[PDB]
């Protein structure tokens, strides 16, 4: 389902968004119940808000600050009171149309909140 960042809610199983990359950190390991996994974190946003993106597996470390990307078949979770966006093995990421897409100074700072 198509979404705007400010509307995201916990446990959305399949989400499509177009966002600018505001920040992108280096990849690192994290522990999980099923084994150790590679991730990276980014902050991404649109005209309605910004959100933390966790990039799993093949997507870890794959994007850069300033890019505009179309993300298809992402999913959301909740962590520490905030909605989290997630990209994994079935998520697709492509470069998108920058034609007038807001720059960082016009992307608001609100983040989607868990109930």
From Swiss-Prot:
It comes from the Archaea. One of its GO terms (cellular component) is cytoplasm. Residues 103-115 have a biased composition (Polar residues). GO terms for biological process: double-strand break repair via homologous recombination; response to ionizing radiation. The keyword Cytoplasm applies. Keywords: Chromosome, Cytoplasm, DNA-binding. GO terms for molecular function: DNA binding. It is found in: Cytoplasm; Chromosome. Residues 19-88 bind DNA. The keyword Glycoprotein does not apply. Binds to ssDNA, binds approximately 5 nucleotides per monomer, binding may be slightly cooperative. Inhibits the endonuclease activity of XPF. Stimulates reverse gyrase from S.shibatae strain B12 (rgy). Monomer in solution, may bind ssDNA as an array of monomers. This is Single-stranded DNA binding protein Ssb. It comes from Saccharolobus solfataricus (strain ATCC 35092 / DSM 1617 / JCM 11322 / P2) (Sulfolobus solfataricus). The chain holds residues 1 to 115 of 148 of the full protein.
